Amino acid sequence: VPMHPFVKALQEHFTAHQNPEKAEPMARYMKNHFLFLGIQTPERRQLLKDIIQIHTLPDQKDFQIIIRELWDLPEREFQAAALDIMQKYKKHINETHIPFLEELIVTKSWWDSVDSIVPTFLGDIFLKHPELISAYIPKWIASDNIWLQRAAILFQLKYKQKMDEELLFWIIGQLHSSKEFFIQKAIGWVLREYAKTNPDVVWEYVQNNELAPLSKREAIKHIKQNYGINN
DNA sequence: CCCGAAGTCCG
DNA sequence: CGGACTCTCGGG
Numbered sequence: 001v002p003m004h005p006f007v008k009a010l011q012e013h014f015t016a017h018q019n020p021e022k023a024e025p026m027a028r029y030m031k032n033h034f035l036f037l038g039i040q041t042p043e044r045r046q047l048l049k050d051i052i053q054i055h056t057l058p059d060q061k062d063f064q065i066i067i068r069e070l071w072d073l074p075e076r077e078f079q080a081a082a083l084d085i086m087q088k089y090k091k092h093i094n095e096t097h098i099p100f101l102e103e104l105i106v107t108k109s110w111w112d113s114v115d116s117i118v119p120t121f122l123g124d125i126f127l128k129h130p131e132l133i134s135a136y137i138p139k140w141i142a143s144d145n146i147w148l149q150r151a152a153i154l155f156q157l158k159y160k161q162k163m164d165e166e167l168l169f170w171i172i173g174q175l176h177s178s179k180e181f182f183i184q185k186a187i188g189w190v191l192r193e194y195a196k197t198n199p200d201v202v203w204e205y206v207q208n209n210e211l212a213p214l215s216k217r218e219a220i221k222h223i224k225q226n227y228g229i230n231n
Numbered sequence: 232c233c234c235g236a237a238g239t240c241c242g
Numbered sequence: 243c244g245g246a247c248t249c250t251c252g253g254g
Protein backbone atom coordinates (compact mmCIF):
# COMPACT_ATOMS: atom_id res chain seq x y z
CA VAL A 1 0.00 0.00 0.00
CA PRO A 2 1.54 3.34 -1.03
CA MET A 3 2.38 6.23 1.24
CA HIS A 4 -0.60 8.50 1.90
CA PRO A 5 -0.68 11.07 -0.97
CA PHE A 6 -0.61 13.98 1.47
CA VAL A 7 2.65 12.66 2.92
CA LYS A 8 4.09 11.96 -0.54
CA ALA A 9 3.22 15.54 -1.55
CA LEU A 10 4.79 16.95 1.58
CA GLN A 11 7.92 14.85 1.03
CA GLU A 12 8.24 16.07 -2.55
CA HIS A 13 7.75 19.73 -1.64
CA PHE A 14 10.12 19.72 1.34
CA THR A 15 12.80 17.89 -0.63
CA ALA A 16 12.63 20.44 -3.44
CA HIS A 17 13.52 23.19 -0.91
CA GLN A 18 16.25 21.33 0.97
CA ASN A 19 19.39 23.19 1.98
CA PRO A 20 22.38 20.88 2.49
CA GLU A 21 24.54 23.74 3.75
CA LYS A 22 22.10 24.38 6.62
CA ALA A 23 21.39 20.68 7.13
CA GLU A 24 24.92 20.06 8.41
CA PRO A 25 24.80 22.44 11.41
CA MET A 26 21.17 21.53 12.06
CA ALA A 27 22.08 17.84 12.35
CA ARG A 28 25.09 18.64 14.55
CA TYR A 29 22.83 20.61 16.92
CA MET A 30 20.85 17.40 17.53
CA LYS A 31 24.14 15.50 18.07
CA ASN A 32 23.78 13.83 14.65
CA HIS A 33 20.94 11.58 15.77
CA PHE A 34 18.96 12.56 12.64
CA LEU A 35 19.35 13.44 9.03
CA PHE A 36 18.08 16.93 8.19
CA LEU A 37 16.89 18.47 4.92
CA GLY A 38 18.03 21.88 6.20
CA ILE A 39 14.68 23.70 6.36
CA GLN A 40 14.08 25.98 9.31
CA THR A 41 10.72 26.45 10.97
CA PRO A 42 9.32 29.54 9.17
CA GLU A 43 9.84 27.97 5.76
CA ARG A 44 8.84 24.49 6.93
CA ARG A 45 5.51 25.87 8.17
CA GLN A 46 4.85 27.64 4.88
CA LEU A 47 5.68 24.53 2.85
CA LEU A 48 3.20 22.55 4.93
CA LYS A 49 0.65 25.32 4.46
CA ASP A 50 1.23 25.13 0.69
CA ILE A 51 0.34 21.44 0.72
CA ILE A 52 -2.78 21.92 2.88
CA GLN A 53 -3.97 24.65 0.50
CA ILE A 54 -3.54 22.37 -2.52
CA HIS A 55 -4.63 19.01 -1.11
CA THR A 56 -6.70 19.93 1.98
CA LEU A 57 -5.99 18.43 5.39
CA PRO A 58 -6.67 14.66 5.28
CA ASP A 59 -9.84 13.30 6.82
CA GLN A 60 -9.41 12.74 10.55
CA LYS A 61 -9.75 8.97 9.98
CA ASP A 62 -6.20 9.19 8.58
CA PHE A 63 -4.71 11.46 11.25
CA GLN A 64 -2.67 8.82 13.11
CA ILE A 65 -1.68 7.19 9.79
CA ILE A 66 -0.22 10.48 8.49
CA ILE A 67 1.69 11.10 11.71
CA ARG A 68 3.20 7.58 11.74
CA GLU A 69 4.26 7.82 8.10
CA LEU A 70 5.95 11.17 8.70
CA TRP A 71 7.54 9.80 11.87
CA ASP A 72 9.07 6.97 9.82
CA LEU A 73 10.72 9.26 7.28
CA PRO A 74 14.44 9.85 7.88
CA GLU A 75 14.74 13.62 7.93
CA ARG A 76 13.89 15.40 11.16
CA GLU A 77 11.73 18.03 9.46
CA PHE A 78 9.12 15.37 8.80
CA GLN A 79 8.68 14.77 12.54
CA ALA A 80 8.47 18.52 13.13
CA ALA A 81 5.83 18.78 10.42
CA ALA A 82 4.05 15.79 11.95
CA LEU A 83 3.75 17.70 15.22
CA ASP A 84 2.48 20.77 13.33
CA ILE A 85 -0.15 18.54 11.70
CA MET A 86 -1.12 16.97 15.01
CA GLN A 87 -1.91 20.46 16.35
CA LYS A 88 -4.36 20.89 13.46
CA TYR A 89 -6.25 17.81 14.75
CA LYS A 90 -6.09 19.02 18.36
CA LYS A 91 -9.85 19.08 18.91
CA HIS A 92 -9.97 15.36 18.00
CA ILE A 93 -7.32 14.19 20.49
CA ASN A 94 -8.54 12.77 23.78
CA GLU A 95 -7.56 10.40 26.56
CA THR A 96 -7.78 7.38 24.22
CA HIS A 97 -4.70 8.78 22.41
CA ILE A 98 -2.30 8.46 25.36
CA PRO A 99 -0.77 5.17 24.06
CA PHE A 100 -0.39 6.69 20.58
CA LEU A 101 1.40 9.67 22.12
CA GLU A 102 3.62 7.37 24.26
CA GLU A 103 4.72 5.59 21.11
CA LEU A 104 5.67 8.89 19.53
CA ILE A 105 7.70 9.83 22.61
CA VAL A 106 9.78 6.63 22.47
CA THR A 107 10.38 6.54 18.69
CA LYS A 108 12.80 8.93 16.97
CA SER A 109 13.29 10.32 20.48
CA TRP A 110 15.10 13.54 21.37
CA TRP A 111 14.26 16.69 23.31
CA ASP A 112 12.87 18.53 20.30
CA SER A 113 10.10 16.01 19.64
CA VAL A 114 9.44 14.95 23.23
CA ASP A 115 9.13 18.53 24.50
CA SER A 116 6.63 19.27 21.71
CA ILE A 117 4.46 16.29 22.73
CA VAL A 118 4.50 16.34 26.52
CA PRO A 119 3.54 19.71 28.10
CA THR A 120 1.01 20.45 25.34
CA PHE A 121 -0.79 17.31 24.14
CA LEU A 122 -0.30 15.10 27.20
CA GLY A 123 -0.52 18.09 29.53
CA ASP A 124 -3.94 18.97 28.18
CA ILE A 125 -5.19 15.37 28.41
CA PHE A 126 -4.13 14.95 32.03
CA LEU A 127 -5.59 18.34 33.01
CA LYS A 128 -8.97 17.11 31.79
CA HIS A 129 -8.48 13.54 33.10
CA PRO A 130 -6.26 13.74 36.17
CA GLU A 131 -7.60 10.37 37.34
CA LEU A 132 -5.61 8.78 34.48
CA ILE A 133 -2.23 10.09 35.69
CA SER A 134 -1.67 7.08 37.92
CA ALA A 135 -2.31 4.72 35.00
CA TYR A 136 0.83 6.03 33.26
CA ILE A 137 3.20 8.08 35.42
CA PRO A 138 4.38 5.23 37.68
CA LYS A 139 5.25 3.11 34.64
CA TRP A 140 7.03 6.03 32.96
CA ILE A 141 9.19 6.69 36.02
CA ALA A 142 10.12 3.04 36.35
CA SER A 143 10.91 2.51 32.69
CA ASP A 144 14.38 2.36 31.19
CA ASN A 145 13.43 5.17 28.80
CA ILE A 146 14.66 8.60 29.85
CA TRP A 147 12.12 10.29 27.57
CA LEU A 148 9.18 8.75 29.41
CA GLN A 149 10.84 9.84 32.65
CA ARG A 150 11.13 13.35 31.20
CA ALA A 151 7.46 13.14 30.18
CA ALA A 152 6.52 12.37 33.79
CA ILE A 153 8.39 15.49 34.93
CA LEU A 154 7.23 17.92 32.26
CA PHE A 155 3.58 17.09 31.56
CA GLN A 156 2.56 19.60 34.29
CA LEU A 157 4.97 22.26 33.00
CA LYS A 158 2.26 24.77 32.03
CA TYR A 159 -0.29 24.00 34.74
CA LYS A 160 0.46 27.11 36.85
CA GLN A 161 -2.19 27.29 39.56
CA LYS A 162 -3.48 23.83 38.55
CA MET A 163 -0.15 22.24 39.46
CA ASP A 164 -0.48 19.17 41.66
CA GLU A 165 2.34 20.06 44.01
CA GLU A 166 2.37 16.81 45.97
CA LEU A 167 2.54 14.86 42.70
CA LEU A 168 5.21 17.13 41.21
CA PHE A 169 7.50 16.76 44.20
CA TRP A 170 6.87 13.03 44.42
CA ILE A 171 7.89 12.65 40.78
CA ILE A 172 11.03 14.74 41.29
CA GLY A 173 11.91 12.75 44.39
CA GLN A 174 11.74 9.55 42.35
CA LEU A 175 14.14 10.93 39.74
CA HIS A 176 16.44 13.27 41.72
CA SER A 177 19.30 10.76 41.78
CA SER A 178 19.37 10.32 38.01
CA LYS A 179 22.72 11.08 36.40
CA GLU A 180 21.03 11.74 33.04
CA PHE A 181 21.39 15.33 31.87
CA PHE A 182 17.93 15.37 30.29
CA ILE A 183 16.32 14.34 33.59
CA GLN A 184 18.33 16.75 35.76
CA LYS A 185 17.54 19.59 33.37
CA ALA A 186 13.84 18.74 33.13
CA ILE A 187 13.64 18.86 36.92
CA GLY A 188 15.30 22.28 36.90
CA TRP A 189 12.96 23.54 34.18
CA VAL A 190 9.70 22.44 35.76
CA LEU A 191 10.77 23.91 39.11
CA ARG A 192 11.93 27.16 37.50
CA GLU A 193 8.64 27.44 35.66
CA TYR A 194 6.47 26.58 38.63
CA ALA A 195 8.41 29.14 40.70
CA LYS A 196 6.79 31.77 38.46
CA THR A 197 3.49 30.78 40.12
CA ASN A 198 4.61 29.77 43.64
CA PRO A 199 8.20 30.85 44.35
CA ASP A 200 8.01 30.20 48.10
CA VAL A 201 7.14 26.52 47.64
CA VAL A 202 9.92 25.98 45.11
CA TRP A 203 12.48 27.79 47.26
CA GLU A 204 11.59 25.71 50.30
CA TYR A 205 11.74 22.52 48.25
CA VAL A 206 15.17 23.14 46.76
CA GLN A 207 16.66 24.28 50.06
CA ASN A 208 15.40 21.20 51.96
CA ASN A 209 15.49 18.29 49.46
CA GLU A 210 18.35 16.66 47.57
CA LEU A 211 18.75 17.63 43.92
CA ALA A 212 21.49 17.37 41.32
CA PRO A 213 23.52 20.63 41.32
CA LEU A 214 22.31 21.36 37.78
CA SER A 215 18.69 20.89 38.79
CA LYS A 216 18.95 23.21 41.78
CA ARG A 217 20.80 25.94 39.91
CA GLU A 218 18.33 25.92 37.02
CA ALA A 219 15.38 25.91 39.43
CA ILE A 220 16.43 29.08 41.25
CA LYS A 221 18.08 30.97 38.35
CA HIS A 222 15.42 33.68 38.65
CA ILE A 223 13.98 33.46 42.16
CA LYS A 224 17.35 33.55 43.93
CA GLN A 225 17.13 37.33 43.34
CA ASN A 226 14.07 37.46 45.59
CA TYR A 227 15.64 35.60 48.51
CA GLY A 228 19.33 36.43 48.30
CA ILE A 229 22.48 34.33 48.21
CA ASN A 230 23.71 33.79 51.75
CA ASN A 231 27.45 34.07 52.36
C1' DC B 232 10.49 45.06 18.64
C1' DC B 233 11.15 42.55 23.38
C1' DC B 234 12.03 38.42 26.55
C1' DG B 235 12.84 33.63 28.08
C1' DA B 236 12.95 28.72 26.67
C1' DA B 237 19.17 23.21 23.64
C1' DG B 238 24.35 24.20 22.04
C1' DT B 239 29.85 25.72 22.46
C1' DC B 240 33.94 27.36 24.90
C1' DC B 241 36.65 28.28 28.90
C1' DG B 242 38.53 28.29 33.57
C1' DC C 243 31.08 22.34 38.26
C1' DG C 244 29.27 26.91 36.43
C1' DG C 245 29.67 31.38 33.86
C1' DA C 246 29.44 33.60 29.48
C1' DC C 247 27.89 33.30 25.37
C1' DT C 248 25.38 31.56 20.50
C1' DC C 249 21.29 30.82 17.57
C1' DT C 250 16.34 29.47 16.88
C1' DC C 251 11.71 29.49 18.33
C1' DG C 252 7.28 30.96 20.67
C1' DG C 253 4.98 34.26 22.81
C1' DG C 254 3.95 39.01 24.53
Ligand SMILES: Cn1cnc2nc(N)[nH]c(=O)c21
Nearest residue numbers: 235236237238248249250251
Ligand atom coordinates in the same frame (compact mmCIF):
# COMPACT_ATOMS: atom_id res chain seq x y z
C1 LIG D 1 17.81 28.98 27.10
N1 LIG D 1 17.52 28.12 25.96
C2 LIG D 1 16.85 26.95 25.98
N2 LIG D 1 16.71 26.36 24.83
C3 LIG D 1 17.32 27.20 23.97
N3 LIG D 1 17.41 26.93 22.65
C4 LIG D 1 18.05 27.86 22.02
N4 LIG D 1 18.20 27.71 20.67
N5 LIG D 1 18.60 28.99 22.59
C5 LIG D 1 18.55 29.34 23.96
O1 LIG D 1 19.07 30.36 24.40
C6 LIG D 1 17.84 28.30 24.64
